[PDB]
Design an enzyme around this catalytic site. Structure first.
Site, PDB file in Angstrom:
ATOM      1  N   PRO A  22      -6.763  32.828  49.090  1.00  0.00           N
ATOM      2  CA  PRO A  22      -7.590  34.031  48.949  1.00  0.00           C
ATOM      3  C   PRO A  22      -7.068  34.906  47.810  1.00  0.00           C
ATOM      4  O   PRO A  22      -5.874  35.184  47.723  1.00  0.00           O
ATOM      5  CB  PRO A  22      -7.436  34.718  50.306  1.00  0.00           C
ATOM      6  CG  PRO A  22      -6.115  34.265  50.799  1.00  0.00           C
ATOM      7  CD  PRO A  22      -5.974  32.844  50.331  1.00  0.00           C
ATOM      8  N   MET A  23      -7.965  35.361  46.940  1.00  0.00           N
ATOM      9  CA  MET A  23      -7.512  36.084  45.752  1.00  0.00           C
ATOM     10  C   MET A  23      -8.502  37.165  45.348  1.00  0.00           C
ATOM     11  O   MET A  23      -9.616  36.854  44.905  1.00  0.00           O
ATOM     12  CB  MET A  23      -7.276  35.129  44.584  1.00  0.00           C
ATOM     13  CG  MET A  23      -5.919  34.505  44.520  1.00  0.00           C
ATOM     14  SD  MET A  23      -5.844  33.348  43.133  1.00  0.00           S
ATOM     15  CE  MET A  23      -7.214  32.286  43.545  1.00  0.00           C
ATOM     16  N   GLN A  97     -11.871  35.939  54.090  1.00  0.00           N
ATOM     17  CA  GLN A  97     -10.694  36.678  54.520  1.00  0.00           C
ATOM     18  C   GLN A  97     -11.053  38.142  54.745  1.00  0.00           C
ATOM     19  O   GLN A  97     -11.597  38.803  53.852  1.00  0.00           O
ATOM     20  CB  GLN A  97      -9.573  36.562  53.501  1.00  0.00           C
ATOM     21  CG  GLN A  97      -8.368  37.316  53.949  1.00  0.00           C
ATOM     22  CD  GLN A  97      -7.300  37.367  52.893  1.00  0.00           C
ATOM     23  OE1 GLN A  97      -7.441  38.102  51.931  1.00  0.00           O
ATOM     24  NE2 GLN A  97      -6.215  36.609  53.074  1.00  0.00           N
ATOM     25  N   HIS A 176      -6.365  38.772  57.423  1.00  0.00           N
ATOM     26  CA  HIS A 176      -5.281  39.073  56.486  1.00  0.00           C
ATOM     27  C   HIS A 176      -4.269  39.973  57.197  1.00  0.00           C
ATOM     28  O   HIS A 176      -4.453  41.184  57.299  1.00  0.00           O
ATOM     29  CB  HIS A 176      -5.841  39.730  55.234  1.00  0.00           C
ATOM     30  CG  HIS A 176      -4.846  39.882  54.124  1.00  0.00           C
ATOM     31  ND1 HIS A 176      -3.483  39.805  54.326  1.00  0.00           N
ATOM     32  CD2 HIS A 176      -5.017  40.138  52.803  1.00  0.00           C
ATOM     33  CE1 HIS A 176      -2.858  39.987  53.175  1.00  0.00           C
ATOM     34  NE2 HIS A 176      -3.766  40.192  52.233  1.00  0.00           N
ATOM     35  N   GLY A 177      -3.185  39.391  57.696  1.00  0.00           N
ATOM     36  CA  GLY A 177      -2.233  40.212  58.399  1.00  0.00           C
ATOM     37  C   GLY A 177      -0.908  40.216  57.679  1.00  0.00           C
ATOM     38  O   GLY A 177       0.154  40.299  58.312  1.00  0.00           O
ATOM     39  N   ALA A 178      -0.953  40.132  56.351  1.00  0.00           N
ATOM     40  CA  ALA A 178       0.270  39.978  55.585  1.00  0.00           C
ATOM     41  C   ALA A 178       0.363  41.077  54.544  1.00  0.00           C
ATOM     42  O   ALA A 178      -0.526  41.931  54.418  1.00  0.00           O
ATOM     43  CB  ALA A 178       0.316  38.604  54.910  1.00  0.00           C
ATOM     44  N   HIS A 179       1.473  41.032  53.805  1.00  0.00           N
ATOM     45  CA  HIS A 179       1.620  41.672  52.506  1.00  0.00           C
ATOM     46  C   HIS A 179       1.587  43.193  52.588  1.00  0.00           C
ATOM     47  O   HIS A 179       1.116  43.860  51.662  1.00  0.00           O
ATOM     48  CB  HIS A 179       0.550  41.174  51.526  1.00  0.00           C
ATOM     49  CG  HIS A 179       0.553  39.689  51.341  1.00  0.00           C
ATOM     50  ND1 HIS A 179      -0.485  39.015  50.741  1.00  0.00           N
ATOM     51  CD2 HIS A 179       1.460  38.747  51.692  1.00  0.00           C
ATOM     52  CE1 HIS A 179      -0.219  37.720  50.724  1.00  0.00           C
ATOM     53  NE2 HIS A 179       0.957  37.533  51.290  1.00  0.00           N
ATOM     54  N   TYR A 181      -0.240  45.156  54.144  1.00  0.00           N
ATOM     55  CA  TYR A 181      -1.545  45.761  54.329  1.00  0.00           C
ATOM     56  C   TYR A 181      -1.664  46.256  55.762  1.00  0.00           C
ATOM     57  O   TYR A 181      -0.641  46.415  56.425  1.00  0.00           O
ATOM     58  CB  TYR A 181      -2.624  44.777  53.901  1.00  0.00           C
ATOM     59  CG  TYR A 181      -2.537  44.594  52.410  1.00  0.00           C
ATOM     60  CD1 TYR A 181      -2.605  45.708  51.553  1.00  0.00           C
ATOM     61  CD2 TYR A 181      -2.363  43.344  51.844  1.00  0.00           C
ATOM     62  CE1 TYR A 181      -2.514  45.565  50.173  1.00  0.00           C
ATOM     63  CE2 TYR A 181      -2.278  43.196  50.459  1.00  0.00           C
ATOM     64  CZ  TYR A 181      -2.350  44.321  49.634  1.00  0.00           C
ATOM     65  OH  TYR A 181      -2.261  44.203  48.260  1.00  0.00           O
ATOM     66  N   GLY A 302       3.713  30.344  45.229  1.00  0.00           N
ATOM     67  CA  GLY A 302       4.511  29.671  44.225  1.00  0.00           C
ATOM     68  C   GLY A 302       4.525  28.164  44.305  1.00  0.00           C
ATOM     69  O   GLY A 302       5.448  27.533  43.782  1.00  0.00           O
ATOM     70  N   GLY A 323      -2.954  29.612  44.370  1.00  0.00           N
ATOM     71  CA  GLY A 323      -3.563  30.844  43.906  1.00  0.00           C
ATOM     72  C   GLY A 323      -3.764  30.836  42.410  1.00  0.00           C
ATOM     73  O   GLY A 323      -4.874  30.570  41.919  1.00  0.00           O
ATOM     74  N   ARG A 324      -2.686  31.085  41.671  1.00  0.00           N
ATOM     75  CA  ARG A 324      -2.849  31.389  40.252  1.00  0.00           C
ATOM     76  C   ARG A 324      -3.333  30.170  39.492  1.00  0.00           C
ATOM     77  O   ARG A 324      -4.188  30.287  38.606  1.00  0.00           O
ATOM     78  CB  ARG A 324      -1.538  31.916  39.663  1.00  0.00           C
ATOM     79  CG  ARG A 324      -1.308  33.414  39.933  1.00  0.00           C
ATOM     80  CD  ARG A 324       0.124  33.836  39.620  1.00  0.00           C
ATOM     81  NE  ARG A 324       1.077  33.195  40.517  1.00  0.00           N
ATOM     82  CZ  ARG A 324       2.379  33.076  40.284  1.00  0.00           C
ATOM     83  NH1 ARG A 324       2.931  33.539  39.173  1.00  0.00           N
ATOM     84  NH2 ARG A 324       3.146  32.464  41.182  1.00  0.00           N
TER      85      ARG A 324
HETATM   86  C1  LIG Z   1      -4.996  37.665  41.470  1.00  0.00           C
HETATM   87  C2  LIG Z   1      -4.465  37.454  42.863  1.00  0.00           C
HETATM   88  C3  LIG Z   1      -5.100  38.064  43.933  1.00  0.00           C
HETATM   89  C4  LIG Z   1      -4.624  37.880  45.225  1.00  0.00           C
HETATM   90  N1  LIG Z   1      -5.301  38.471  46.266  1.00  0.00           N
HETATM   91  C5  LIG Z   1      -4.984  38.098  47.549  1.00  0.00           C
HETATM   92  C6  LIG Z   1      -5.809  38.438  48.614  1.00  0.00           C
HETATM   93  O1  LIG Z   1      -6.816  39.106  48.399  1.00  0.00           O
HETATM   94  N2  LIG Z   1      -5.505  38.004  49.903  1.00  0.00           N
HETATM   95  C7  LIG Z   1      -4.376  37.237  50.126  1.00  0.00           C
HETATM   96  O2  LIG Z   1      -4.053  36.834  51.258  1.00  0.00           O
HETATM   97  N3  LIG Z   1      -3.587  36.893  49.058  1.00  0.00           N
HETATM   98  C8  LIG Z   1      -3.883  37.285  47.778  1.00  0.00           C
HETATM   99  N4  LIG Z   1      -3.056  36.898  46.745  1.00  0.00           N
HETATM  100  C9  LIG Z   1      -2.047  35.811  47.013  1.00  0.00           C
HETATM  101  C10 LIG Z   1      -2.678  34.406  47.156  1.00  0.00           C
HETATM  102  O3  LIG Z   1      -3.551  34.302  48.270  1.00  0.00           O
HETATM  103  C11 LIG Z   1      -1.610  33.322  47.306  1.00  0.00           C
HETATM  104  O4  LIG Z   1      -0.894  33.447  48.517  1.00  0.00           O
HETATM  105  C12 LIG Z   1      -0.608  33.283  46.158  1.00  0.00           C
HETATM  106  O5  LIG Z   1      -1.295  33.498  44.939  1.00  0.00           O
HETATM  107  C13 LIG Z   1       0.005  31.889  46.162  1.00  0.00           C
HETATM  108  O6  LIG Z   1       0.934  31.733  45.126  1.00  0.00           O
HETATM  109  P1  LIG Z   1       0.532  31.002  43.744  1.00  0.00           P
HETATM  110  O7  LIG Z   1      -0.211  31.974  42.859  1.00  0.00           O
HETATM  111  O8  LIG Z   1       1.771  30.581  43.004  1.00  0.00           O
HETATM  112  O9  LIG Z   1      -0.354  29.805  44.005  1.00  0.00           O
HETATM  113  C14 LIG Z   1      -3.513  37.081  45.454  1.00  0.00           C
HETATM  114  C15 LIG Z   1      -2.885  36.462  44.388  1.00  0.00           C
HETATM  115  C16 LIG Z   1      -3.353  36.646  43.091  1.00  0.00           C
HETATM  116  C17 LIG Z   1      -2.661  35.976  41.933  1.00  0.00           C
HETATM  117  C1  LIG Z   2       2.324  39.568  46.836  1.00  0.00           C
HETATM  118  C2  LIG Z   2       1.344  39.513  48.006  1.00  0.00           C
HETATM  119  O1  LIG Z   2       0.303  40.439  47.805  1.00  0.00           O
HETATM  120  C3  LIG Z   2      -0.831  39.911  47.194  1.00  0.00           C
HETATM  121  O2  LIG Z   2      -0.751  38.842  46.693  1.00  0.00           O
HETATM  122  C4  LIG Z   2      -2.167  40.658  47.148  1.00  0.00           C
HETATM  123  N1  LIG Z   2      -2.912  40.790  48.148  1.00  0.00           N
HETATM  124  O3  LIG Z   2      -2.613  40.299  49.427  1.00  0.00           O
HETATM  125  C5  LIG Z   2      -2.680  41.224  45.834  1.00  0.00           C
HETATM  126  C6  LIG Z   2      -4.096  41.794  45.804  1.00  0.00           C
HETATM  127  O4  LIG Z   2      -2.002  41.208  44.858  1.00  0.00           O
END
Ligand SMILES: Cc1cc2nc3c(=O)[nH]c(=O)nc-3n(C[C@H](O)[C@H](O)[C@H](O)COP(=O)(O)O)c2cc1C
Ligand SMILES: CCOC(=O)/C(=N\O)C(C)=O
Length: 365
Positions: A22-23, A97, A176-179, A181, A302, A323-324
């Site tokens: 999710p991103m 999500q 989404h119960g992480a990070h 938030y 990662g 993700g990325r």
């Molecule tokens: C641009 C961006 C937006 C993200 N937004 C969310 C999000 O909305 N919800 C969430 O659970 N994680 C979010 N994350 C984290 C990703 O879901 C994921 O856990 C993380 O990118 C995995 O690592 P990776 O980029 O090396 O693959 C985001 C990451 C990026 C790079």
């Molecule tokens: C580092 C974990 O936080 C995230 O990736 C995030 N959302 O969950 C965003 C929008 O950057």
């Protein structure tokens, strides 16, 4: 390649284990899902592949980013419906999500310029800055600590948004119960300084997420519900004195919900502690959580092709979300299978509003 053996996620037959993480990309102008989103998801959708959407608002108060989609209005449902449809025409499974940032917001993102809501009044420290709609960064404000009545309303926001996603045709939702938030602000004892039934003990801190998960499982069925947690992450001052015990207590709650519902959740989604916006200590936490949870485990944070393969081969996870690399490689599933070279990503267009640039103009092979 372990990543390309089929995997049964509840009632869903996935053909591979590469998951779109999710991103938040901030292309859902005015919180309405846009055609841009549909092209974006369609690009990444594969036959038998699992996709999780960008975090999605459950309420007018749950945003802390610009132009993130909601799924609390019928307008949003109808525009989400058009996106779910093109995803399904490619044969993919898609979860929405559900995302409430809690205190990770700003007056500018809140109706009537109100305070963001949270478990506490402790603000995020000045180490963290919030991206503003004009591209500058702002100061996180002091949140309003909500009472138990409002907590139940938030739980109901989750439940209603869970039904709306189904109405929109989503195969399920992720909590989404992480990070750091909203849910993490109740879980982590570095944040939750409450003295009522939602704070103090570890059980109490776990009450909010348990109730949210129970409501959405009641609403749409346990097998359409995923849960994301990150018991140990460096993000938005979200720390716990005992991350692994917090992790295990959440997992026990989830196991208990599954037994009482008589059905397994879709999955548990856990962020590797190395991910940001000791190594064995971090791998320890992940496998310890995986071994404790009765059901499907998605790891995230990662991962690379190599790390993804090993994770599945070694039993550390059933599914691996990227993700990325999925931002910049729309055919990332195809590239992983062929072991084709991956395309770099441009951080600077992660959160911009353009419906094409840095969003859908990353090439295929
Ligand atoms: C641009 C961006 C937006 C993200 N937004 C969310 C999000 O909305 N919800 C969430 O659970 N994680 C979010 N994350 C984290 C990703 O879901 C994921 O856990 C993380 O990118 C995995 O690592 P990776 O980029 O090396 O693959 C985001 C990451 C990026 C790079
Ligand atoms: C580092 C974990 O936080 C995230 O990736 C995030 N959302 O969950 C965003 C929008 O950057």
């Amino acid at each position: 390649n372990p990543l390309f053996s089929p995997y049964k996620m509840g009632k869903f037959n996935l053909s591979h284990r590469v998951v779109l993480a999710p991103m938040t990309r901030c292309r859902a102008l005015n919180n309405i899902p846009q055609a841009a989103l549909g092209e974006y998801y369609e690009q990444r959708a594969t036959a038998g592949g699992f996709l999780i959407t960008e975090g999605t608002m459950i309420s007018p108060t749950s945003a802390g980013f610009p132009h993130v989609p909601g799924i609390f209005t019928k307008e949003q449902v109808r525009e989400w419906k058009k996106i779910v449809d093109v995803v399904h025409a490619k044969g993919a499974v898609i979860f929405c999500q559900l995302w409430h940032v809690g205190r990770a917001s700003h007056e500018v993102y809140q109706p009537a310029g109100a305070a963001p809501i949270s478990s506490t009044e402790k603000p995020i420290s000045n180490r963290w800055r919030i991206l503003m709609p004009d591209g500058t960064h702002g100061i996180y404000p002091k949140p309003r600590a909500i009472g138990t009545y409002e907590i139940s309303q938030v739980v109901e926001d989750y439940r209603r948004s869970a039904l709306n996603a189904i109405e929109a045709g989503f195969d399920g939702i992720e909590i989404h119960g992480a990070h750091g938030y909203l849910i993490d602000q109740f879980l982590k004892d570095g944040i939750n300084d409450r003295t009522d039934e939602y704070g103090g003990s570890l059980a109490n801190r776990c009450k909010f997420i348990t109730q949210v998960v129970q409501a959405v499982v009641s609403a749409i069925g346990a097998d359409r519900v995923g849960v994301r947690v990150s018991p140990a992450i460096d993000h938005l001052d979200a720390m716990d004195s005992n991350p692994l015990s917090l992790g295990l207590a959440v997992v026990e709650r989830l196991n208990k919900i599954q037994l009482h519902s008589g059905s397994k959740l879709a999955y548990l989604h856990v962020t590797q502690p190395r991910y940001v916006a000791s190594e064995e200590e971090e791998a320890r936490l992940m496998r310890t959580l995986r071994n404790a949870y009765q059901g499907t485990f998605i790891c995230s944070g990662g991962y690379t092709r190599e790390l993804g393969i090993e994770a599945v081969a070694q039993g550390d996870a059933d599914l691996v979300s990227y993700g990325r690399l999925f931002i910049s490689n729309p055919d990332l599933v195809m590239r992983i299978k062929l072991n084709a070279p991956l395309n770099k990503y441009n951080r600077k267009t992660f959160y911009t509003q353009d419906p094409v640039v840095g969003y859908t103009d990353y090439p295929f092979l």
